Every structure is written in structure tokens, then in C-alpha cells.
Design an enzyme around this catalytic site. Structure first.
Site, PDB file in Angstrom:
ATOM      1  CG  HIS A  66     -57.761 -16.805   6.913  1.00 28.26           C
ATOM      2  ND1 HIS A  66     -59.020 -16.487   6.451  1.00 28.26           N
ATOM      3  CD2 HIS A  66     -57.002 -15.706   6.725  1.00 28.26           C
ATOM      4  CE1 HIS A  66     -59.028 -15.238   6.032  1.00 28.26           C
ATOM      5  NE2 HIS A  66     -57.824 -14.728   6.233  1.00 28.26           N
ATOM      6  CG  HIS A  77     -53.673 -11.510   6.596  1.00 23.92           C
ATOM      7  ND1 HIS A  77     -53.919 -12.524   7.495  1.00 23.92           N
ATOM      8  CD2 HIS A  77     -54.807 -11.374   5.871  1.00 23.92           C
ATOM      9  CE1 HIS A  77     -55.139 -13.006   7.301  1.00 23.92           C
ATOM     10  NE2 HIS A  77     -55.682 -12.351   6.290  1.00 23.92           N
ATOM     11  CD  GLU A  78     -55.236  -9.130   2.653  1.00 24.95           C
ATOM     12  OE1 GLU A  78     -55.797  -9.286   3.765  1.00 24.95           O
ATOM     13  OE2 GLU A  78     -55.608  -9.696   1.607  1.00 24.95           O
ATOM     14  CG  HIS A 107     -54.910 -14.171   1.843  1.00 22.79           C
ATOM     15  ND1 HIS A 107     -55.303 -15.428   2.266  1.00 22.79           N
ATOM     16  CD2 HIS A 107     -55.428 -13.300   2.752  1.00 22.79           C
ATOM     17  CE1 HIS A 107     -55.935 -15.332   3.419  1.00 22.79           C
ATOM     18  NE2 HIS A 107     -56.092 -14.049   3.698  1.00 22.79           N
TER      19      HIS A 107
HETATM   20  O1  LIG Z   1     -58.947 -12.225   5.753  1.00 22.93           O
HETATM   21  C1  LIG Z   1     -59.355 -11.231   5.165  1.00 22.93           C
HETATM   22  N1  LIG Z   1     -58.710 -10.638   4.170  1.00 22.93           N
HETATM   23  O2  LIG Z   1     -57.603 -11.233   3.621  1.00 22.93           O
HETATM   24  C2  LIG Z   1     -60.617 -10.543   5.560  1.00 22.93           C
HETATM   25  C3  LIG Z   1     -61.838 -11.464   5.469  1.00 22.93           C
HETATM   26  C4  LIG Z   1     -62.156 -11.772   6.933  1.00 22.93           C
HETATM   27  C5  LIG Z   1     -61.211 -11.022   7.867  1.00 22.93           C
HETATM   28  N2  LIG Z   1     -60.537 -10.120   6.963  1.00 22.93           N
HETATM   29  S1  LIG Z   1     -59.861  -8.796   7.380  1.00 22.93           S
HETATM   30  O3  LIG Z   1     -59.587  -8.032   6.191  1.00 22.93           O
HETATM   31  O4  LIG Z   1     -60.830  -8.138   8.206  1.00 22.93           O
HETATM   32  C6  LIG Z   1     -58.461  -8.862   8.262  1.00 22.93           C
HETATM   33  C7  LIG Z   1     -57.635 -10.112   8.111  1.00 22.93           C
HETATM   34  C8  LIG Z   1     -56.301  -9.699   8.657  1.00 22.93           C
HETATM   35  C9  LIG Z   1     -55.538 -10.573   9.436  1.00 22.93           C
HETATM   36  C10 LIG Z   1     -54.285 -10.163   9.915  1.00 22.93           C
HETATM   37  C11 LIG Z   1     -53.818  -8.882   9.626  1.00 22.93           C
HETATM   38  C12 LIG Z   1     -54.600  -8.007   8.846  1.00 22.93           C
HETATM   39  C13 LIG Z   1     -55.850  -8.415   8.371  1.00 22.93           C
HETATM   40 ZN   LIG Z   2     -57.123 -13.021   4.999  1.00 22.94          ZN
END
Ligand SMILES: O=C(NO)[C@H]1CCCN1S(=O)(=O)CCc1ccccc1
Ligand SMILES: [Zn+2]
Ligand SMILES: [Ca+2]
Ligand SMILES: [Ca+2]
Ligand SMILES: [Ca+2]
Ligand SMILES: [Zn+2]
Length: 158
Positions: free
Chosen positions: A123, A113-114, A117
């Protein structure tokens, strides 16, 4: 905004969560770079010293960007979109318990996921996409990118 303007990308692991075996950190982040290279022209190599493009960091609380971690739960991890310096870097909350499995927080799934990014993705509003903003464990052994994920990344690369 940003996308890497090159095909060879390097990552470095800053330090290792004590939550896991070393080799298991290496493998989880490696598998997570393989997810995106599977669907882009990019190639990802782990270098062990100097300036990588993507720096992978384990840290808790105030860790010296502006995106302070919040303890266990909440924000699991965060990353910067492409660019110089801190651009690309992906930071994992050491207040989480990182795992190879369904327990605590699966590092592989999070790193995928990171890296999205780190690569220039935002997202998705699909709950099925790995870029959907809510961590949901899915079997990592059979993990497969959602079609929404593929369209988004291929929107940036290739
Ligand atoms: O998106 C995020 N980080 O990149 C933050 C800001 C809001 C939600 N999150 S999170 O870290 O809590 C989790 C996001 C995520 C999605 C899919 C898999 C792992 C983590
Ligand atoms: Zn994220
Ligand atoms: Ca947290
Ligand atoms: Ca960087
Ligand atoms: Ca931890
Ligand atoms: Zn950070």
C-alpha cells in the site's frame, strides 16, 4: 518480498460475479492487467483452463484461505503477492455489488489495486495512488496511475 521472475504471466477467471454481464467482467480484469503492463515489461494472457499464475476468484465469507471476507462494505477484495500456488491470486468479495461504473464497487478500479498486490506492491500512503488502502471511485474512462504507483511498480520491474 516477492516479484515474478518471468515476463509472460497468465490469469484465469475462476467464476463470475452474478452482479455483472460476463463480457464486462472479462473486460474490467483485462483493462486492469493493461494498466500495469503499460508500465512494466510484463505481458498478461487469459487462459481458460489449468494453472494460471494469477487466479481471479469471486467469494464471500470464509473462502478457504485465512483472509475471511466480512460481508458488504469493509474489505472489498484481497490478493497474494507473487509466488507459487495461491501466490498472485486475487479474490473479490461477492458481498460487494461489483460494477462497470460509479455505482456499488467499480471492479476495474478494485482489480487494478489487487493486481498491484498480485505483482508485489504493498500500500501507498498517497490518497492519490490506486494502492492507497481506501477505495475512492474515480472516472474509469480517464483513469491514470499516480506517479507514486509508477515509481513503486517500476521499483520491482523493468
Ligand atoms: O487493501 C485491501 N485489499 O487489497 C483491503 C484491506 C484493507 C482495505 N482493503 S479494501 O479491500 O477494503 C480496499 C482497498 C482498495 C483500494 C483501492 C481500490 C480498491 C480497494
Ligand atoms: Zn490492498
Ligand atoms: Ca466486504
Ligand atoms: Ca497463483
Ligand atoms: Ca455481489
Ligand atoms: Zn481470499
Amino acid at each position: 518480498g516477492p516479484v515474478w521472475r518471468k515476463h509472460y504471466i497468465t490469469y484465469r477467471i475462476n467464476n463470475y460475479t452474478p452482479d455483472m454481464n460476463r463480457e464486462d467482467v472479462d473486460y474490467a480484469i483485462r483493462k486492469a492487467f493493461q494498466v500495469w503492463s503499460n508500465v512494466t515489461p510484463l505481458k498478461f494472457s487469459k487462459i481458460n483452463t489449468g494453472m494460471a499464475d494469477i487466479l481471479v476468484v469471486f467469494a464471500r465469507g470464509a473462502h478457504g484461505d485465512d483472509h475471511a471476507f466480512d460481508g458488504k462494505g469493509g474489505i472489498l477484495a484481497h490478493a497474494f503477492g507473487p509466488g507459487s500456488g495461491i501466490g498472485g491470486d486475487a479474490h473479490f468479495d461477492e458481498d460487494e455489488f461489483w460494477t462497470t461504473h460509479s455505482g456499488g464497487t467499480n471492479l476495474f478500479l478494485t482489480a487494478v489495486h489487487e493486481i498491484g498486490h498480485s505483482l508485489g506492491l504493498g500500500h501507498s500512503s498517497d490518497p492519490k495512488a490506486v494502492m492507497f488502502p481506501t477505495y475512492k471511485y474515480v472516472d474509469i474512462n480517464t483513469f491514470r496511475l499516480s506517479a507514486d504507483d509508477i515509481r513503486g511498480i517500476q521499483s520491482l520491474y523493468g
